[PDB]
């Protein structure tokens, strides 16, 4: 359906982070596992 991405980038409604990521509020998605 959607392209989606990993780490800091975006995670809107239609863009639900597949992997175990964590957003903030401005749609970014991230985690201590990989990124920061």
Curated annotation (Swiss-Prot):
Name of the protein this chain belongs to: Insecticidal toxin LaIT1
Cellular component, GO annotation: extracellular region
Function: Affects the activity of both ryanodine-sensitive calcium-release channels RyR1 and RyR2 with high potency. At lower concentrations the toxin increases full openings of the RyRs, and at higher concentrations it inhibits full openings and induce openings to subconductance levels and reduces the number of full conductance openings. The different actions may be attributed to the toxins binding at different sites on the RyRs, with binding at a high-affinity site mediating the increase in full openings and the induction of subconductance states evoked upon binding to a lower-affinity site.
Molecular function, one GO term: calcium channel regulator activity
Protein's UniProt keywords contain Transcription regulation: no
Superkingdom of source: Eukaryota
Residues passing through the membrane, by range: none
Keywords: Calcium channel impairing toxin, Disulfide bond, Ion channel impairing toxin, Ryanodine-sensitive calcium-release channel impairing toxin, Secreted, Toxin
Organism annotation: Liocheles australasiae
Subcellular localization, as worded in the UniProt entry: Secreted
Free-text tissue specificity from the UniProt record: Expressed by the venom gland.
Note: This toxin may reach its physiological target by traversing membranes, which may be by slow permeation. Alternatively, scorpion venoms are known to contain amphipathic helical peptides that form pores in the cell membrane, and it is possible that these pores would allow this toxin to enter the cell.
Cysteines joined through disulfide linkages: 11-23, 17-29
Impact after mutating residue 15 to A: 12-fold reduction in insecticidal activity
């Amino acid at each position: 359906d959607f392209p989606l991405s990993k780490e800091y980038e975006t995670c809107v409604r239609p863009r639900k982070c597949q992997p175990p990521l964590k957003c903030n509020k401005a749609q970014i998605c991230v985690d201590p596992k990989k990124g920061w």
